[PDB]
Structures are given as structure tokens and as C-alpha cells.
Scaffold this active site. Structure first.
Site, PDB file in Angstrom:
ATOM      1  N   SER A 253     -10.118 -28.359   2.428  1.00 58.57           N
ATOM      2  CA  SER A 253      -8.690 -28.677   3.269  1.00 58.57           C
ATOM      3  C   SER A 253      -7.995 -30.097   2.861  1.00 58.57           C
ATOM      4  O   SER A 253      -7.165 -30.200   2.081  1.00 58.57           O
ATOM      5  CB  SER A 253      -8.950 -28.408   4.424  1.00 58.57           C
ATOM      6  OG  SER A 253      -8.223 -27.237   5.022  1.00 58.57           O
TER       7      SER A 253
ATOM      8  N   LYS B 150      -1.984 -35.371   4.816  1.00 55.29           N
ATOM      9  CA  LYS B 150      -2.187 -34.110   4.535  1.00 55.29           C
ATOM     10  C   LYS B 150      -0.775 -33.358   4.742  1.00 55.29           C
ATOM     11  O   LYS B 150      -0.189 -33.520   5.803  1.00 55.29           O
ATOM     12  CB  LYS B 150      -3.219 -33.479   5.229  1.00 55.29           C
ATOM     13  CG  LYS B 150      -4.011 -32.182   4.666  1.00 55.29           C
ATOM     14  CD  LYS B 150      -4.713 -31.501   5.708  1.00 55.29           C
ATOM     15  CE  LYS B 150      -5.373 -30.302   5.268  1.00 55.29           C
ATOM     16  NZ  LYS B 150      -6.087 -29.504   6.401  1.00 55.29           N
TER      17      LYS B 150
ATOM     18  N   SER C 281     -13.354 -29.627   7.353  1.00 53.64           N
ATOM     19  CA  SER C 281     -12.373 -29.818   6.529  1.00 53.64           C
ATOM     20  C   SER C 281     -11.878 -31.217   6.505  1.00 53.64           C
ATOM     21  O   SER C 281     -11.075 -31.679   5.680  1.00 53.64           O
ATOM     22  CB  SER C 281     -10.994 -28.933   7.057  1.00 53.64           C
ATOM     23  OG  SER C 281     -11.142 -27.537   7.025  1.00 53.64           O
TER      24      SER C 281
END
Lengths: 455, 456, 456, 454
Positions: free
Chosen positions: C152, C77, C176
């Protein structure tokens, strides 16, 4: 005088300047100072207030006629809420139950020219065949003050009979209009289910499904054309009343007729048997193909009605209302309806409810070939005031046996028109005009109605 | 192709001579032979009979049309007596109980040229949302045979959805027309009280005040137009039906619409909520005033319907024919309706009817301002076949909560039109017309309805 | 194929000489080339660099594997600093913000042999359940690009689900990690508090006392073993993370499972409940004890989370980064969290924190009886891509209700393992091992995870 | 002499037939009768109850020892709950608040054979550096009763110092066990965050995050050895305390030590600084690398602590319990914490919390290079009892600055062992064993602890 005049009649006088509305009311109010202490028919009268409405209407309109009931004085049952009066329901507990609003029916009439004189007297819970009220007192038939006025709506019929009002407003759950009618000699219409809206502010009883099918609001009058007039005012479906139906009124041009003597297992005197027999001929004279022996057996129908109602009265109603009720009526209900009390078990209530549909399903197929049924209301001439005062069972039952032609109309949500001879006319639902029409034909042939005199 | 054709497209090509009534009846009877093994949607099929009816009427009227439903094959619920067809009620005991006469509705339809293809499957006591009979078995969704067809009129809806009938006929005491229609992706109309008469030769149910108030007979279709044609025929009043009221059918000018979501306490799947939004949008594009958050608290309404019906079912009906019905079916009633069961004390049964009137009063008042309510029907896509199988009380409550937009229309004797998307329009009694009008107006904007073939 | 392989299978292949590490990387980048145009799941790719790294390893270690994660391509991420990759936070303002150093979790994974394919798309402030960035756009579910990939960490989930990465890494303050995995049909583990260190060089958050309680970093995967391996590497405490605790990881024997449905007030769709029933049954078959109607009343817990997070987002965060974030994302926060905004009065906020500890001290007591809670993550299958697009307060409230089973895990600092079916296992802090084992047991008895190709 | 005896000393006498648990309890109880009128340390006593308990054990085990705290009379602060003993919190309103249950800490102590002699007086909300309550009144130092036995847990310090208890338990949000310890010249350990469970039947303070972060429960003793014994019993996580963490307690082979003089901005007397210097020299004599001018700038730390705690006290706490508190203590908080009050804007409260992390992140890194910090607690010898009496803001600011060495330990959830000298040893979380060990090494070298007799 006006107090003895038809609606159109007293209307024409106002028009011709003969009498003012102020006159018409005041005359009525004076007669009520004289006659009503005797009858005890009115309980709460708005003389000061009504006279104000008489003046103003006289002022603005004058010889102008506002609505169909402009300058028509009326008697309103306690059960129909009127502002500035009380929905006492005959109970001392509800003495200061002042009404802030007018039920739609009331409002409907006043909109056409109300002149509502006062609140007519009723039994303790409006569930009696004698207008005996713990609060107010005992209504006394103006004809014979020893006799009974009627069941629930008797006060109204007394005010119409004793000229103290041109027209009156009553309800017929259990012959609570057609019975008091026959007793006071006045005309009485129980409308069918779906024709007249019932929107009560402070309401008598709840809105059970039983009164939705069996109970209606109707007029009292001394002419058939008076009746037709009051009907056309109150008739009409209101969205807010779900029992109200948007269905046009109907009439059959060739109404074949039938007579119902003993198909409801009643015990009728030869007095009313003769009155009925009289009414029959008048019809055939007026080209009505009246027939006998053709009515299917509805012996159970009054009983079904008795059970449904009685069960709820004893098991549901009384355990609250018996406290403030007259022990007269409490014992009346216990004694009268105690037989058919199906008890607290619902399997039995369901059972009797389904038999109704059995009977009814039959009755509706009959009225296709016999749309109008002439029949005995009371089955008894006007009884004494003591007819139901702490009488025993068997005694209570024997009454029910006599008044056994009254309830079946309620049970099947049928329109029942009470003629002054104490005979009624019953038809199909929404055919209420057919009754008014045919009752206009017998109005001439039969004896004419006259105002009563407790002089 | 006939099987994919509207009542109008059929009547056109019959007249054009490109098809015949026989060709139509045979096309369907063929497809029935292919698909009905899978769907089990049709219990009894009067093939030969109806085939000859078409040849007879092919001969009489030829390219002319007898009336509205000429050359229209129809699926009829087992709950409607058709001449020579068994009135099973789903129960095996009534397997050889044959109907001498047509029911009023069946006559009316047949009189308008309607050719009855056959009887449609029903649940064991016509009191279930899944069409499983101990006589004829389970009826499956043509769209997905893994999912339920719906109850009680789940056969007719499956038939319509699978081109085995252009139209169908059903009853709706609970969501018994709208639910199947929603699940099977077809139109379905629950009339209001009084508009369509019930004159049953052999009755599905007692003439309870419950049935009188809350139960009506209505059509299934693939087109909003075909709905009205069917409502047109069946509508009208009979003197022999006391409940049937002789009131003119009504219509409103530019009716307002009120979006109902959780005002009955329903648990809605996102999809069904998405379809609600999509229907609201189409209404708004079709020039309707649609308002949100306007509907009063009717959360007791589905509940009061469960108490009236549940008390009766458990205490009255089930003790009678409880032994002759599927155990799945018996347990459902006991599982779902057990909590609402008021017991045998009449005083409580009286109370709930009084609560009905409190609610009814409220809604009738609101419906003057907002005459039409747009609402989800089932709030879930067609569940699996085992969805009501011995699930238990706790699970049964959860299902109930999902179907809480269906029962309130019945409690207040109101008309409900179920769109194939599973969204319903509801209006006041006798105003059935303006549901047909609204559904027609929104029809071009929303997804289309197509027949489904499970085998191919 | 490597793109469909588990770590064990990759590592096995490398050791057997079936394929090279460079072979594995190149395959993934090949797939990425085809699918990533559709998914938009990778925001920045280090393809040339990663191939050098895998080549290098092939040189040194050859068929010998010197890492648990050697030969494993990994999605990371944007929220995690990777050296030479930008830490955008999805915002155009931070588009040229490059990282010098790897975050602890990144380093750990890389030192275990893991090979970073590239960064994954994220929402604008990493505060949304739909991965829509002003810099990189929207990420779409590989299984249905008409649907959202998740909240997310939707990129990472999307990458792993489409075989563009064997493994991925994300963070979970709301749902998330769990929401994306459920939506994208992959495994995701939210570690509990203290187990995995947070040492962010360019932080996406400010180390609020809330992030310290409710926010953790964890893996995505297609297998329970792969989730285990990944957790083993990142797990462990660092002195420089105060929220990190030096505690051993733990596993109870024959753990007990409680079923959580509406105890948080969640509006669950019928499929999610059905899937819940499936996971329960799989557990029961694998010897687990499962109980229903046992979980306390945690309806306020979602709302206490919303109040704490919302008060701060609206009043603290949104004012600093308001113009730079998408309007879609900004209005989502205002629409949904606007309901639970307590305003600036400290006295309100303090109390909501005390309400947490109240609810927390009940759950910790109950967990001693029933250590593992099985529950839905989201109440819905992956919603449409427009699910949060300017829906308004009322619809945002409805959505919040559907996601009421995700936020309570964060509020109480608890580990949550999301199964690919969108059902989650939740346990006590430091008992992450029990989740990993329970998931492995039911893994054979539940539908299998497969990679997805939108292009083909 | 049991009243001057270590857990091990009196463990010897029970087991030698020298005395009985009863003897010890009665002894401690007797001495209490005399000394307590001066100290006013014990608010509630349970003499019949405890003696009963000692006799029972005498009859059961006799010269056998039940647990590591068998035969140990102990003082438990009012904040902790003992069955039957009342939880006043110093407020007269709760004079008839009786406890049906014991807190886990107390349970564990008692289950180790400990004998709770009675509850100890505390300030009005346990939020003051002088032990003055509306119910039981003022508490006086057994060494010099003109001077206070400060802190929230002032009584327990007094009781242990005075011989009226071998051991004691207190709680440290501010310096609330370390300060008393230093003022009354006895050992006092403040555990770090997560080590000892806080399960309270009737809570003293809210279960706020600030209590979770900065609040712990700890023991008082006159021996470093008896401290370890205590901490070993109360230590360990409990599932019902979310703040308790199941982490093994840790120790270091060779810890480096950093001397913290003025890095928190503290104002230190010459007496205290020489004790620091003495402690530093003792450390060096014990073979420790001790380093100076190493500690980073933690001058905002005492300030951040006051902001958080203070802002709450004034806006949340005081309005709640305002009228029932002593106007002395009411004013103390308003006077001292009024400057630090940030008001009702959350954005401000949020700001100082973030600031804590920054500072914290720095210190945790430092604590790796220099694991232990030697520092002053008070920086003022036991003040006169009137130190906090209506002294006003400016004067309250001066006090704050003296004690600036105590509250930072709490802010970062760190363990603090206050030596009898008023010097403390702080380390990393979960490294409480390192403190106990350093203490035991310095004990020989630094000055001895004698029991006080007013």
C-alpha cells in the site's frame, strides 16, 4: 505315487498326461484325511477351493506346464497370510481373522503354480520349539508321533514329511525353520537377510529391528533341487519391503569348509556328533577342503540373541499376548528366556546389541577364509512332546544349552540350510546358492529322504 | 589456477605438463597458510608428507595419471583415520591418539592417486551442526567468517569452499554432510545404506544399529562430476563391513521428482524456499516431471530420529564422555534433544523404531511413483557462529524445526545429495547414481560454485 | 545535508540561518530527480508549487519557525487528497481525477508548516504488499531495487528511506504502513482506532464498518522523535469523523513487554527472529521488563481478518473494480484471499466477527498484564519484486503464513509502531505515546537509519 | 416516605437517624409484596440477602454515608447479572441458570452502597416492546395495568414508577429503556457508545458489532438528579470492554436545540405532540435557543436500524432460540422485522451498513450546529397490553412507524434521555452531561413525577 515324488517328477507326469493336477492335489488331500488326524500338521485346508484351481489349470494349460511350481502342492504356515484362510497365530481370539490378501511370498509361488493345500499349524505366538497351539492342538512328528514336530514351522515340516505336501513354507527367527526340519527329517532353508521379501497383511509380531536382522522366510522340501526351486521363486527384492536388498545372489567356486562343534558352547549327543562327522567326510569326498578347530569362539552369540529376544518377549510382548497364550508357552518363555531378561532399562539392550556387532564383525572376516560352516542344528535328537511342558528353569536352560547352535545364524542374519540328517550349512549373506549347490553334492553321498508313514 | 580447478582440470594440466602434482599440492598448502588462520577449517596438516608424495608420484607416473584422483588434494574429516594423523574426535583427551592405519575409505581414495592434504576440524563429539572443538576451536565460513561452517563435517566443506581442497570426505548421521555443504556453498553427498563401507581403525561412534541404519560416509566437492569420481572410488562393498551390502548401483529412466516443503514440518526461510523454486524450475527445464503436494505426512520422521538419537546421546553417550566435551556442545544436546528424550524405559525406544518402520513402509511405496524428492536441506542460510550457543530449550526447538528436512533421509537410510544452493535431491537406496545424474543435468542452469578467500 | 536531516536538524538549520526553507525543498527535489527514476516512489510531484510555499514562509517567518513541521518536506500517499493532485488510487480510470480540497490529515500537517513534495505511488486498489500500479508502475526499495518497497504505502516508505522526503504519510488496513517501513528500513506508526481522523473527500474505501475498525492513517520517518512530532499534528478528533473519539492520549509507567513469536502461526525467517532477539535485548538494556511464552493463542486472529477482508474484497469490491485493476493485483487477491472467502452467506460472516470479539476480549485482558507486545512485522526481509506475481493459491498461502504477525493489530484496532529493523511494538488503544517512548529508548541501541541512493 | 424518596431525601433520613438502610429496604420490600402481583415487574427478589446487606452497612457506617448510592434500593434487569440471582432472559430453559459473579455495572452500583432489591421481568430475548416472558409472564403498568409497561426493560420502569425501587438499570438496543421510561412516566437515560462498559458474565445478546454500535446500558429514576448520580457511578471505561472508550465526558456552554417531529417518518398522536410542544416551551422558558424544521431527512435511519437488527434476528437469532421463545414474541419479530429482512446475501447487509455511515456523517455535522435534539420517543401513549399480540405485518408496520422516533438514536450510537413525559433529549456522544443538565432545568417547568399505586 506323486505324494512321494520330486517337484520335477510330478511335473513330468502332468506333462506326459500321467496324472492331472486335480489328481495330484486330490491324492494329497485324501492322504491328509488319513495321516493328518495323527500329525495335526495342517490347521485349515482349502480342499474345495484348491481343487478348483487344479481343475482350471488342468483345463487351460493341460499338458502345458505354467510355471516352475505348476502342479506342486504346498503347505503354508499360519504366519504367511493366504486369502480365505486365517492368520490365527494359534490364538482363539483370532479365529475369525480371515485373510483378504496373500503375502507376497505366497502370491509369488501361486504365480508359478501354487496348489496351496492348507494352513500349517504353529505354536501359540510362533515362539516355541514345539508346535503346540491352544486353538488347533499338538503337531505330532510323523516319524514318531510321540516326539515333537518342531519350533514354529513344525506343522509345515510334518506336512512335507508325511507326504501331505511336496513343499512347505516356514520362518526362522529362532531356528523356527531349521530346527523343525532336523526333527521331521525334511530339508529346510532359512534364507539370509535381504533375499526374500516379507510383506504380511495381518503380521505375526511387529516389524521390530530384531526380526529385520534375525528373522527370515524359507521353504521346506524333501529334495535339494526342490529347495532350490522354491527359493528361486520367492527370492528377489521387493521395493515395498525395506529389508529387501537389490543384491545379486552369489557363489564361490572353491568354498573352503569348516565344522563348528563347541564354539557355541552347545551340549550335543554323539548321535548328531556322528551325523555331523558323517556329513564332513561326504564333503571332502566331494572335493571340499573341510577343516576343524578353526572357528572363532561364538559362545556369547546365542546368549546375545537370547537376551535381545528374551528381553522383548518378557518386557514387551507377553504383557499383551500372555492373556490368550498357552500357559505352557508363557511359562516356557518365562522359564527359558527369563534368565537373559536385560530388564526394562535400555542401556542394557543397547549394550548387548553392540556386542552382536563385535561377534559378527569377527564372523564375517572368518567366512572370507571359511565361507561355509557345517554344524549341528538340534544338538538333541527329536525330543518328546513333553520336552517343554511346564519344565523348570535349569531344565529350561539345559535345553537352550543343547539348542545353542541354532540361534547364532539368526542373530547374524546368516543363511542357514538344514540338511535332513539334522546337520545344517551356513554361509555368507547373499551366498544362499552356495549352500543349495553344496547340499546337492551331499544329497547322493548321504542317506536319501523318504516319506513318513503314521500307519 | 590449480586451487580453482576441477579434478579433471587438474589431471588435464598435469598431463599437459603445465602443472605438476607438487605444484598443485604446494598451491593449496600456500592458500591453506593464508586462509586457515581465519577459517580454522584444517586441524592437522601433513604438508611435508603429502608434498613428497606428489614428487614421488610426479616422478613415477609423470604426465600419465595413476587413476581417478591423481594430483587431487583432499580434506579428510578427523573422524576418518589417516596414517600418522591424530583421531581427536575434537576432544583434547585424544590429542595424542595417533592413527597407525588409513581407514578403508582413505585407502581407497589414496589408492586412486588421492593426496591427503590434512585433517579437517570437527565438533567435540561429532554431534553438532557447528564445528567447535575444545582442542582446535571454531571453524568459520570462508564465504562469511561471521557465519557458521556447519557441523559435523564443517571443516572439510570450508576447505573445499575456500580452495584448500579440491574434494573432501565427511559423515552424515544427522545433516552432517548436507548441512555444512549447504551452508558453505559446496556439493555434498550422503550415500545410502550399504553403498560405501565403514571400516574404522579408531571409531568416531559405537557401531549402534542407529549408526548402521542412519549413518554413512560421503564426499564434498565443487562439481557434480567431481562428486561422482569420489563416490566411484569410495563406493564398493567390503565383507568386513556387515552393513555394506553387495548390490549393484542402480539408475532409473526419466525419474519423477516430488517437491517436499512442509511435509516434515520444517520452517523455511523465503530465500531457501526461493532456491527450492529455482531448482524445481531448472529440473523442469532439464526435462524432469516435478510434482507438488504429493509427499505423504512425514512430520513424525524428523521427530522419531530425534527420539532414537536423543535418547541414546543423553542417556548413553553424554554420561560417558560428557565431562571431556565443550559445555556449549553438551548443552546443545541437552537443550535440543531433551524434549525428544524417551527416558531409559526400553519399551518406548522399541515403539519409536516401530514408528520408523510404519513411516519407512509408507515412503518406500511412494518412492516407486516419485523416485526422487527435491527438498531444502537447512531451510536457513548459514546462521551466525553463536546460533547454537547456550540458546535454551525453547530456542533449540525453533532451530530443530528449521532443520527438519535433514533428519528423515538418515532415518530411512536413503541417499541425499546437497546442491551448493542448499537444496537436496533424495532417492531410494542403491540409486545414488541418478542423484549424480540429476545434479549434473541441473548444474549448468543453477548458479555457479566459486572458491572464496576471506583474507582477500 | 538536509536530505539526511531530522526535523530538529532542519528546523535548527533554518533558525540558525544555515539554510533557507527553499534550500531544503530544492535539495529534496534534486535527489528526487536522480533517485525517483529508479524507485518510482513519487507518482505526482508538486515541485514548482512547493518551492513557492517554502519561499513564502522564508518571507513571512524567516528564521522564526511557526510550526512543529515547518521546513519539513513530506511525501503523501495518493490515498490522501492533496489540492491540485490527482486521487488516482493507482487506477488509469481515475488518472484525471483532481482534488479541490486537502484531507483533514493533510491540512493539519500543512497548517503545522509541513511542505508537501508530492504524491507517492500506491497499489491498484491500495490492497497489496507490493506497490504496483497500472498508471504509475512499480516502486522499488532504494536499498535494493531488486526488492519490493512494501504494501500500500510503499512509495511513502521508499521516499523517506531514500531521503526524497524527511517524513511520509500512509494508511494500514493490513500491514500497509508497517510492512513498507520494515521492507524499506524506516519507521512507521499505525495509530490505533479513534486517535487520528479519517475525513476523505475522494475516498479509496467506502467507510465499511471494517475500515472503521481495522484501518488507520499514520506517519513514516527515520527517527522516533520525527514519528512523535508527526503523530502529534495529525492526532486529535474531528466531529465529522464518527470513528474519531475525543479521548486523551496516554502513557503507562515502566510498561511491560511480551515477546510474540508463533502465537499467530507466523513462519519467521531466521534473521527476523534474530532481529527480534536484538530488539528484546535492547529493551532489557533500556530497563524494560520482557517476558516470553506469555502471549495467548491468537492463531485465528490473522485468519478472522482474512475472512472479513477477503469475503468483502472478492464478493463486493473486486466485482465493481475488477477490469480496471492490474491482473497481477487482482490474481493476488483471488489467490490468497480465495482461501478465507466465506461466500455470500451473512450467517458465516457474522460469526467470524463474533470470533474477533472473543479473541479481542482475551487480548485486552492480557494487555493489562503486559501492555506492550514486541513482535515481527513480516517474517521475511524485503522479498523480491516478483513475490506476489501470479504465484498461485499454494504459494500465496505460504506467503500469508509469513505475514501472520501484521493483520492482528488491525483486527483489534490496536496501535503498532514499526521499527526500521522490521520489529514492531504494539500497545492498547490510545497508548500510542508509550510506543513512541519505548522506540526512542531502544533507538540508540539498535542499528541506525541511513538514507539510500540506488543511483550512487 | 422512603418509597417516594430521592437518593438525597433518603440519604438525609439515614443520616438523620430518621430511618435505617434496613427500614428503607424493608419498606421497599413490603410495598413490593402488595404491588408486585399487579405489576409482575420483579421476576426474582433477594430480600433476605439485601436486608442483611443494609443491616451490615447500618452497623458499619450508620449515619455515615458509604457512597453516593448508600441506602438506595435498586432494580436490576435480568439481562444484568447479580450474584445468586438467575439470568433467565425470560426463557424457561434458563430458569436454573445462576450467576457466580456480578456484571461490572452492578458491581460499581453496589460498591457505591447501592442495594439491589432484585431482578426485573423482561421479554423473551429482551427483544420486544412489551415485557412478557415465558417464565414470569406479563408485566403491567403501575399507572394503568390495562396498558403495558413496554420496552425490554419494562419491569425496572414499573419498579421505579411504582415505588418498589428508587432507581433501576436497563439496556437500549432499540428503544428498550427510553420506551419503558415514557410508558411508565419516569426518567430513563440511554448512555451513548463508549460511556458505560458492557461486561457480561452470561451475555443476553451476541457481542455483535451492532450491539457494540447501538447497544448501551442505562439507569431509570424519578428524578433528573438521581439519574446523574446513577450515570456518574456506572459511567467510565473499563479495559476489558473494547467498546468502552477512555474519553472524558463533555458539556457545552450554550447548546442550541432542534425539534424533531416527522424527520424519521414517525406517526405521532396529538397527546405526544403537545407534550413535545410543552417540552419545547419549557426549554424556551429555561433560556434555550430552540429551532424547528432544521433536522435533516433521517427517514431511512429507523429503516436501516431494522434492516440490520431485523435481518439478523430472523436469520441468525430466531433459528437459535426459536422454540424456547413465546410464540407471541417469535411472531412479533417475524411480523414487524420481516419486511426489513434483507435475507442472507452479505452484499445487502454490507450495503445498509454503508448507508448508516452516510446518514451518520450528515447527522454528526448537524449536531455541531444544533447539539441537542428534542424528540418524541413513542408517539403513542402506553398502548394496551395486546398491542403486539398476533397483529400481523400490516398492523406491525403501523407500530414501527409510531416508534420510528426511538431507534435512530441507537443507530448512530447517540445518548438519549427520555423525560417522564415521553419526550427525549438526544445529543452527541460523550456529551451525556449536557442532557442531564437540560433535564434538570426543564424539571421545575414540566409536570412532576408521582409514584404510582395500583
Amino acid at each position: 505315487e506323486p505324494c512321494h515324488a520330486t517337484i520335477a517328477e510330478l511335473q513330468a507326469g502332468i506333462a506326459s498326461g500321467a496324472y492331472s493336477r486335480e489328481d495330484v492335489v486330490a491324492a494329497h488331500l485324501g492322504r491328509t484325511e488319513r495321516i493328518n488326524p495323527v500329525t495335526n500338521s495342517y490347521c485349515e485346508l482349502r480342499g474345495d477351493q484348491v481343487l478348483a484351481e487344479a481343475r482350471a489349470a488342468d483345463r487351460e494349460y493341460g499338458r502345458e506346464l505354467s510355471g516352475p511350481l505348476d502342479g506342486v502342492p504346498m503347505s503354508i504356515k499360519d504366519s504367511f497370510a493366504v486369502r480365505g484362510l486365517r492368520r490365527t497365530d494359534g490364538l482363539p481370539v483370532h479365529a475369525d481373522r480371515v485373510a483378504d490378501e496373500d503375502d507376497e511370498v505366497v502370491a509369488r509361488l501361486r504365480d508359478a503354480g501354487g496348489l496351496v493345500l492348507g494352513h500349517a499349524n504353529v505354536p501359540d505366538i510362533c515362539i516355541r520349539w514345539n508346535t503346540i497351539s491352544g486353538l488347533y492342538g499338538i503337531a505330532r512328528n510323523p516319524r514318531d508321533p510321540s516326539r515333537t514336530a518342531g519350533g514354529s514351522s513344525g506343522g509345515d515340516a510334518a506336512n512335507v514329511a508325511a507326504g501331505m505336501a511336496t513343499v512347505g513354507m516356514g520362518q526362522d527367527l529362532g531356528g523356527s525353520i531349521r530346527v523343525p526340519a532336523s526333527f521331521c527329517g525334511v530339508y529346510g532353508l532359512r534364507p539370509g537377510a535381504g533375499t526374500v521379501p516379507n510383506l504380511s497383511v495381518i503380521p505375526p509380531f511387529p516389524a521390530s529391528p530384531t526380526l529385520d536382522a534375525m528373522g527370515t522366510s524359507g521353504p521346506f522340501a524333501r529334495s535339494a533341487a526342490d529347495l532350490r526351486t522354491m527359493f528361486s521363486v520367492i527370492a528377489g527384492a521387493h521395493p515395498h519391503d525395506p529389508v529387501s536388498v537389490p543384491a545379486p545372489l552369489a557363489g564361490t567356486a572353491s568354498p573352503r569348509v569348516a565344522v563348528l562343534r563347541g564354539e557355541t558352547g552347545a551340549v550335543l549327543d554323539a548321535e548328531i556328533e556322528a551325523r555331523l562327522d558323517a556329513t564332513v567326510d561326504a564333503l571332502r569326498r566331494a572335493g571340499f577342503e573341510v577343516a576343524e578347530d578353526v572357528v572363532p569362539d561364538l559362545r556369547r552369540a546365542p546368549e546375545v540373541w537370547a537376551a535381545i529376544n528374551g528381553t522383548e518377549l518378557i518386557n514387551i510382548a507377553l504383557p499383551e499376548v500372555g492373556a490368550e497364550m498357552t500357559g505352557s508357552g508363557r511359562q516356557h518363555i518365562e522359564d527359558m528366556f527369563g534368565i537373559f531378561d536385560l530388564g526394562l532399562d535400555l542401556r542394557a539392550y543397547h549394550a548387548v546389541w553392540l556386542e552382536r556387532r563385535a561377534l559378527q564383525d569377527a564372523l564375517v572376516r572368518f567366512l572370507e577364509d571359511y565361507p561355509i560352516i557345517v554344524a549341528p542344528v538340534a544338538g538333541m535328537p527329536a525330543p518328546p512332546l513333553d520336552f517343554d511342558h511346564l519344565i523348570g528353569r535349569e531344565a529350561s536352560a539345559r535345553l537352550f544349552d543343547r539348542m545353542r547352535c541354532v540361534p547364532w545364524v539368526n542373530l547374524f542374519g546368516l543363511p542357514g540350510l538344514a540338511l535332513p540328517n539334522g546337520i545344517q550349512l551356513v554361509t555368507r549373506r547373499f551366498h544362499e546358492p552356495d549352500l543349495l549347490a553344496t547340499a546337492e553334492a551331499i544329497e547322493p553321498l548321504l542317506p536319501a529322504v523318504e516319506v513318513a508313514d503314521p500307519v
